[model samples]
Target: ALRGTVTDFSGFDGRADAEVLRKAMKGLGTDEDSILNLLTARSNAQRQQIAEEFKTLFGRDLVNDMKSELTGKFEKLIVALMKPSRLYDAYELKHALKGAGTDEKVLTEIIASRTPEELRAIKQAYEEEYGSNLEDDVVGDTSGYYQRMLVVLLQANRDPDTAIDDAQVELDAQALFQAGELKWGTDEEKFITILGTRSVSHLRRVFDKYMTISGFQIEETIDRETSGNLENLLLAVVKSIRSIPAYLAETLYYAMKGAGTDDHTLIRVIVSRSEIDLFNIRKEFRKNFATSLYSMIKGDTSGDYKKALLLLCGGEDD
Candidate 1:
């Protein structure tokens, strides 16, 4: 949730950056270096400022100019940078639900990772942009226990901080065990309430107690008990409890792992985490997978897309 590296907001001059960006985009052959250098190195908030300044100074849309100049995944990456992170996330959520059949992983990754305040802003963005309630759309897009959990999450009521109490952990653990694994039939509401409401720190402790109480890991129970989006969302709750970056690293590895690249997932994770925990995610990637994330991108991508990803990744492949 916290950024590992940040561009100092004070040292940056959005107008100067915008002027250089205008010059880079105005010429016959765009200064790809200039565009890449200015955009990738700054935080997304800074990029939004530069975009505003670019419009004021040049009387041209920076995005439009970049669209004319750049192409492919590289262009996608640059355009993503220019939007405010919350608005960008709102757009991401919209895109996830736009077509037939939802992107369950994208929905899980986003809703699970964002803080309550962040979710509130995203909900506001979702309403303003789509003129529809996020809850209604989520309700429309999902069904069963899966839909129930998402609706709970969409309420954005997660406790921000928790001081671990052994007694509380034990109680929650017992409730969780009795809810699904122990019962002849599952009471999914019990599972959702505990998972959705507990603070992440408290949940970690609860999981530890759950291991002692149930003799089965919560994740294992989730896999055995639930199927479909319900299964995915529950697993996401556990992963988010453990570590957001580790969860995201898994998302990124899977995004590039299979036959075709999930460019949307790749771009979303890299761009969103660039200023956040891309560095920690990189560590988790290299640690969890045999190959480094840098190696994977080099194998799977090329040109400016590859360059921007590697810069965010912060290292080279072995």
Candidate 2:
């Protein structure tokens, strides 16, 4: 109810009276800082309306209008909130800054950053707006290992269908046993086929059956079979729908809870992954442990890190 009302208040009524809004903007403009607060602190719906209203009444683009009304990250943010479409372009821009001629920070932040859902959003918006895929953009725009990672993520081809198939799991496990898990190079095709093509539910069942019959966890076996960050990332992704939030929360916990602080990872995870599954992650934490994300972060981390993490976690305190 609050969400709907706030959306209507800031988006509809705020724009219905164009002259009043213009006057309010004009009045606030005289006090630069006040105008800054008004725009920056607005709910995303409000910003979206403001952007559209600016265009409807003044015949100017909102992104461009923001150039006159705001500056710095404040402008970037206001511009982002204007619409889901633009928000994604900004996200991609941030994501693509990687590799030979690109920005590693943005790539790491984007690739290492986003949750499964946010990644899905990027793919959706890219296709809708550009008439081409996001991965294609990353392919054409970036280069090297970073490009490979970007492409993999843009594909976001991971399966969401998690179902039980004990027979399939048995065959998958047998192939693994035959492929030298007891010896050498590993069942590359056997494992890859399942890992790459199977859904999370399917994979979960496969792993379960593998353990049920073979008596070894799929993750432990993968550790035995694979090496390097790509492998680690893939293995991590195998448990993505299941362990993603917990892993990130644990990372967040360690980051802010400690003295030196892993600010880079901390900011990347919280800022980049918030929209993806953090909400769901919070629910998981609460349900499983009977404690909120805030209590864990608060009990572990402190100061500005605490503030930033709390704010990123939607301002929860326990």
Candidate 3:
């Protein structure tokens, strides 16, 4: 559901790119509502149009601005998300950081959500760009046979259009065994092994089977088996498996519900997750909380923070 159309779709700005983006936003002031509407709801075609409009109307490349403005993990994720081709680029970078110093959060998010073709493209692009395979990068940075398992998982390359994979049931079952039950003491090492690597397609099936067999969701199992950021990463994988909307809603709720706002978490979650799942996210927000995600943002944040968030939440009109 587009809210009418962008007036400027051809002329672009190299100068004042930032201000032009603000202007391309609907309404007055910082039209975050317009920003969200464009980024989240549009199809790939529509998004490209919006990006073009962003360029012509604002005199700047939206993609480039997003790159120059955001940095570190956030920068990488945002840039990768806006374009279908480069999204594969983002996933590859995510897979690149496995093993000891790996950013588990990124690992779970990328490996758990990308479809097979997207994953395959990521593998190819990563090798082309970095001169090494994604799995090789993971292996270089990691240790031992468990490293091999994690690397193997990253290569799953799930197909988004395909239906559930039934034949993978046994293989999926075994992957779970290696992680949780193949031996004793919960196999924390194996837990790391399984969570970091698998394709989202395979993991969805495995999670279903695991839930059927253990009567516990992988998130709960991860909670039982690990803690801190490591647990966060695995739980991210589990949440990425099914309802990212629910996942984001839960994260946002926690970010805002405490007596004081966890501003860092609040900003990071809203900013990062929006490009990926804000449509379903807003749906989940209204369904679960009975309040619109927009309303929640209005109440919980203010000024520039609120502006950036409202852009993600998609409510340019009001």
Candidate 4:
């Protein structure tokens, strides 16, 4: 639903592509490589158009045919590609919350990374698909000060005004200092009110001034002031303000870091950021970890999943 880097074919003919797709899927056995090459080469928008044309031409659903032919992670990745952006995000969110405990990282990654307009659409899709409110689901699932912070963020009312006022920066810094480190008791709601509501540029300035005033990074202050998911969510906000690419890169790296991979997370970040700033994320990954994301995926994954991720990543490894 976010940035996609796939260059749209200059002279895309959806019908022609659709025909090619049918040919690949029609025979006794599937021509998986050819199918992957054609489908993966096109952007998601183009793929949707092709799906429509495929139905009109063959009186069948392209996605269905592909699903019938493909299996395993390959099938999963292809289905993900076929869905409309909003529907895809809605399903992902649904999957995150479907079972017992919430996929808190998924929730945080999605809620923290999306712009107000994007989140509005996602929230709309969330209700439409699940017949329930995203906010209320989160409220029901999460607890502590963390839930309170998410409730605030779910409002999608972050001040978008980018104009930076020096006095306001200092003023915010002082307010933050008083709210947490400067006082015995921290005002968690006040932190949510300011950090949750401020513009990115303004927040950056406020953090800078906060460091000067408190002699502690805003993150450090947040660390000492809060605990648990609330701490993670607030740090997510700070990291997002500092560098979204870095934040996303960190998320992607950690997803694949341990004994087993977090497939959904890997899929979400690589798919969501691939078009937006994956190039920068690749840079940030290397910068932060002294290793390339491309290499990490290569080392951590196998078969079609790895291939699909590499296709989306579109970069060299050293």
- lDDT by residue (1-318, candidate 3, tens digit) is 312112222443423433445565435434444444434434444456557766776676787765655454334434443655444445436544744566544444555555556567777777776676777766676555345444545666333335666767656666666566445656665555445555556667777888777777777777776666556656765786666667767767776785767654455455445445656667777788787777877788765446545655664332
The whole-model lDDT of each prediction reads: 0.84, 0.55, 0.57, 0.84
| Ranking according to lDDT, highest score first | 4, 1, 3, 2
- On a 0 to 1 TM-score scale, where does candidate 2 land against the true structure? 0.61
Q: Which stretches of candidate 2 lie over 4 Å from their true place?
A: 1-12, 16-46, 55-90, 97-121, 127-133, 136-163, 176-180, 213-216, 247-277, 285-292, 295-312, 315-318
lDDT of 1 by residue, 266-295 (tens): 988888877778778888888899778889
Candidate RMSDs in Å, in order, are 2.2, 6.1, 7.3, 2.4
lDDT head-to-head 2 vs 4, winner = 4
Query: lDDT score of model 4?
Result: 0.84
lDDT of 1: 0.84
**lDDT of model 4 at residue 219?**
95
Q: Which 10-residue span in candidate 3 carries the lowest summed lDDT?
A: 1-10
As for candidate 1, its clashing pairs are: none
* Regions more than 4 Å wrong, model 1: 9-11
Error of 2 at 138 (Å): 4.8
